[PDB]
Amino acid sequence: RAPPQFVVRPRDQIVAQGRTVTFPCETKGNPQPAVFWQKEGSQNLLFPNQPQQPNSRCSVSPTGDLTITNIQRSDAGYYICQALTVAGSILAKAQLEVTDVLTDRPPPIILQGPAMQTLAVDGTALLKCKATGDPLPVISWLKEGFTFPDPRATIQEQGTLQIKNLRISDTGTYTCVATSSSGETSWSAVLDVTESGK
Amino acid sequence: RAPPQFVVRPRDQIVAQGRTVTFPCETKGNPQPAVFWQKEGSQNLLFPNQPQQPNSRCSVSPTGDLTITNIQRSDAGYYICQALTVAGSILAKAQLEVTDVLTDRPPPIILQGPAMQTLAVDGTALLKCKATGDPLPVISWLKEGFTFPDPRATIQEQGTLQIKNLRISDTGTYTCVATSSSGETSWSAVLDVTESGK
């Protein structure tokens, strides 16, 4: 009496070769839809309660999950999750992309860069920069493209730049830069210097 | 709560090209199984409630019937009817054989041939033979391989042989033969002749 509907559809997935992949396909209706899967273009249907092969790396659980173990590159393509009751049908496609395994350490990340500040002449400024990464990023700075720190400035040990006794010359854009053996990233912010500071 | 089960499975069918073929696949269970079909080896599933193609010659009714119209020879092969509930699954295969259309009139049929009779010397015998056919069969007879009717015997107009005043010589096997421009068929029976008749 109630057509099948999706609670959680499956979405696309890119994953390294040899890993295990699971696509949700959660469903509701009355009667309760029993989901099965089909690789697009394949004659094989994958039904929930079976022995099953056992040589097959594909299994479907009674909750609607399609688990594929030890994926190889021939498993890439589209997978259709499906359900048929006397009340209706629904299908949903999700794409599997199989990649090579690569020892690739991601580049550093700046979770919080400097923020825009208007400050007052001959005060202090601490423009912050919190980076994370493995290997661990070295922080460094630029002012309108050029390196930074003159006298008057010095980079702290968490990475915050420290400028003291500002003046109208010290306005402009300051760029945080986190770099490591795996990449660089940057995060900019403008700092204005008035005598007012407001 | 009640696994799907077949009430009427589909069976094999041989039919002339261009005709329409329907395979039953009637089902029971709880919840009520919704049948779908799949040509074996094909990625296409045929679901009950759909627009559907309209260019497709295959449709599945909500009762589980697979109708294929104007069959051509590429439709031959195996067709799988299937049903999945939260309670279980069932499949059943049936084979479609597509033939050429042939103007072939079937051969005659003998629906009732002579029956075994023990009769008494110098009585009468009417060994019956009811044939049917289009074109209509000519009936004729043999006694132990040789044609039949001597004097004493004559074929009636419905086809019954008529022998009178039997004797111990007239025992043996009598064969009815129905023949037409489309075939022959035969039906034998032994007739024994005692002086007793019992």
Transcribe A92-110 into DSSP letters.
EEEEEEEE-----PPPPEE
Domain range annotation of chain B: 1-102, 103-198
Asked whether the beta carbons of residue B34 and residue A85 sit closer than 8 angstroms, the reply is yes
Count how many Cα atoms sit within 13 Å of the Cα of residue B117 in the half-sphere of its side chain. Answer: 18
CA dihedral B162, B168, B170, B174 (to 10 degrees): 100
Q: Can you tell me whether residue A170 is helix, strand or coil? A: helix
Domains B1-102 and B103-198 share a fold: yes
Please state, in angstroms and rounded to a whole number, the distance separating the CA atoms of residues B174 and B187.
9
CATH topology of domain B1-102: Immunoglobulin-like (2.60.40)
Q: Which amino acid makes up residue B29? A: G
Distance CA B159, CA B146 (A): 17
Closest C-alpha among A18, A17, A30, A20 to residue A65: A20
d(CA B9, CA B50): 23
Burial class of residue B173 (count of CB atoms within 10 Å of its CB; 0-12, 13-18, 19+): middle
Alpha-carbon separation of residue A13 from A23, A98, A104 (angstroms): 8, 9, 19
- Data resolution in angstroms: 2.4
From chain A, pick out residues whose CB is under 8 angstroms from the CB of B31.
31-32, 85-86
Least CA distance to A85: which residue of chain B? Answer: B34
Cβ-based interface (< 8 Å): residues of B facing A: 31-32, 34, 36, 38, 40-43, 45, 47-49, 62, 82, 84-86, 88-89
Q: Do A86 and B32 touch (CB under 8 A)?
A: yes
Q: Do B49 and A85 touch (CB under 8 A)?
A: no
Q: Between 3.30.360.10, 2.60.40.10, 2.40.50.140, 1.20.1250.20, what CATH number should domain A103-198 receive?
A: 2.60.40.10
CB contact under 8 A, A49 and B85: no
Nearest residue, CB atoms, B31 vs list A45, A85, A89: A85
CB pair distance less than 8 Å for A84 and B34? yes
Approach to solving:
X-ray
